[PDB]
Structure formats: C-alpha cells, structure tokens
Amino acid sequence: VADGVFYAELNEFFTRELAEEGYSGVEVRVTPTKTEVIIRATRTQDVLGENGRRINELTLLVQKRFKYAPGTIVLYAERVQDRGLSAVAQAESMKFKLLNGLAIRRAAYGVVRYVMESGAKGCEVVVSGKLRAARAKAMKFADGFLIHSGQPVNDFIDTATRHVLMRQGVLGIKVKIMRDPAKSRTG
C-alpha cells in the first residue's frame, strides 16, 4: 500500500492541478506491477475531459513528477459529495465529536469553521436534550450556533394551526402571517 508521503504529495499536486474541477481527495491501491490512483471530485466531466484528454495528460504529467515508468500507473475517477457541504457528514462528525468528550460549543465551532472554510454561504448546528441541570425531568434545552442564516424579517412571523373534522377525513390547517415592519416602526 501507498505511504503517507505519497498521499500527501498527491494531494498537493492535485489541489493545484485540479483547482476548479472541484477536487476532493484521492484513494490509492497498489497491486502486482500496477499502481491505481482513484481521483475523487465533485464533477468528473471536467476531469475525464474530451475522451480522456485531461486524464491522459495528468497520467503522463504524474509520471514526470513522481518518476513512474510508463504503464505502471493509471488514473480513475469517482464522483463524491463535498465533505464540507454535506449535512449528513457534518452531523455524523458532530456525533463523533460528542461521543469523544468534546464540549458541545467546541464541537459546533469545529464544524461551523470547517463548513465555512469549505465555502458554504451559511451553517447551523443545534444540539438538544438534557444539556444542563433542571428541577423538572421533562425540561429540555437546545444550544444553537449559526453563521449567515435568516433575515430580520423572520422575527415578524406568527403562525397558528387548526385541526378540522371533515367527512373525507381530518384536515390540518396552517397559517403563516409575516407582519410588515414598516407599519410598526416608531414615528
């Protein structure tokens, strides 16, 4: 199997060589006189290119940079979701963090930092349950952490629901009214 130096150097090479092709990372396996390097990106159309144009160019430019003889390495491609934009991955990540004794606030911060550095427009983390001591056993808490989520105009929203019995079955009604701030502004 490939060593950590190889992973590191491949990562350096590709992040620069595949800047806008949404490069994620790389997997690599070693076999009898063959070495396989799987490239993972968000879009594989730019990577494979016109009939392997970008692929074969890389494959040879990789030989020159890592001194492999022709025919000893080959480049593959796989589409993967960006990890820093994956809600699923970050929730799982938060799960790991919590299960290993990291304070909620610090875990939230980690994820939020990672997601913004990954280029999101906004991120929200919320952890809920019996986070602090309370006299009522049924009392529950939520700590939320957010960057760039929502407008000031969301604080002018009231909602009601009703439950109505009809012949065809029971219907649910929900009404949302967003009040006009420019009708309650002082003076």
């Binding site: 990540s93 610090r106 990672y114």
Partner: protein
C-alpha cells in the same frame, strides 16, 4: 557542505523509518547540526515531513531530539514549523494521514503551530477534518481555542 544527493538519501531514510541508519549517519558521517537543513529536491520538504506523514513516532522523536540538542531554540521553532513549496508543515501531512501519536508529539512537547496556512489557505485543523481523521481533529479542538473566522 552537504549536497542534494546525500540530503535525499537522509530523508528517504526518514521516510522508510530506518532509524538505525539515521543515528548511524548523525553520529559519524554528518554533523547533527545539519539535519535541520536537509530538504527534498522538488518539494523542499524536510525529514520531519517524511517521518511525520508515515507515522514513524520513534524516528520523529529522534529527529526532534537531535535538532533541539544541536541547534538554537529559534532554529528549532523554525524547523518544526518549516513549510515546503506548497506551504505545508510536517503537522499538515501528519494530520492528512491521521497520525495521532506524531501530532501529540509535535504539539504537546515541541509546540507546533496548527494554524499555519498553506498556499491553498488551509491549516492542519482543516486538513484533519477534510480527510475524515476525526481522532486528530477532536484532539485539536480540545487542545486549542478553535473558532470560525472572517
């Protein structure tokens, strides 16, 4: 003094983890004062880089002990946090490859900076999380006061 071909041999040995021939080299053939100057041809990566990326903790500790003993305190700091052409510290590589023992050694005993940002704008904190190395990442978030930025 020390030519490129022999700098290469020294760091190929750090890569391999041949600690035995490393002590061999620096007790008899090269001054330990010069270990901190051996850099790869293409990358500018040090021997610390190679050993760190490969999780060879005993080799890593030796390299650090030797450099510390043979150089000034300023020279030691500049070495641990030395960056290659791509702007990566040994820590960056250790975090990418999820080598926890190396990381604790670098940060606890030898006070490596995990906030150094590379040519792409990423620090060790990012790199760990970006490669799914949750053990290294959780260590960072406990050890340091890490918050999101502007």
């Amino acid at each position: 003094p020390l030519d490129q071909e022999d700098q290469d041999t020294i760091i190929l040995d750090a890569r391999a983890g041949d600690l035995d021939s490393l002590k061999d080299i620096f007790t008899t053939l090269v001054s330990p004062e010069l270990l901190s100057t051996c850099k790869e041809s293409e990358s500018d990566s040090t021997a610390l880089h190679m050993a760190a990326a490969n999780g060879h903790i005993e080799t890593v500790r030796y390299i650090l002990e030797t450099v510390s003993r043979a150089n000034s305190a300023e020279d030691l700091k500049a070495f641990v946090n030395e960056v290659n052409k791509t702007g990566n510290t040994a820590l960056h590589w250790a975090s990418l490859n999820g080598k926890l023992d190396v990381v604790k050694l670098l940060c606890d005993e030898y006070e490596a900076d995990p906030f150094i940002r590379n040519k792409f704008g990423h620090d060790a904190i990012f790199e760990a999380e970006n490669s799914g190395k949750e053990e290294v990442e959780t260590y960072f978030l406990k050890k340091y006061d890490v918050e999101p930025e502007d």
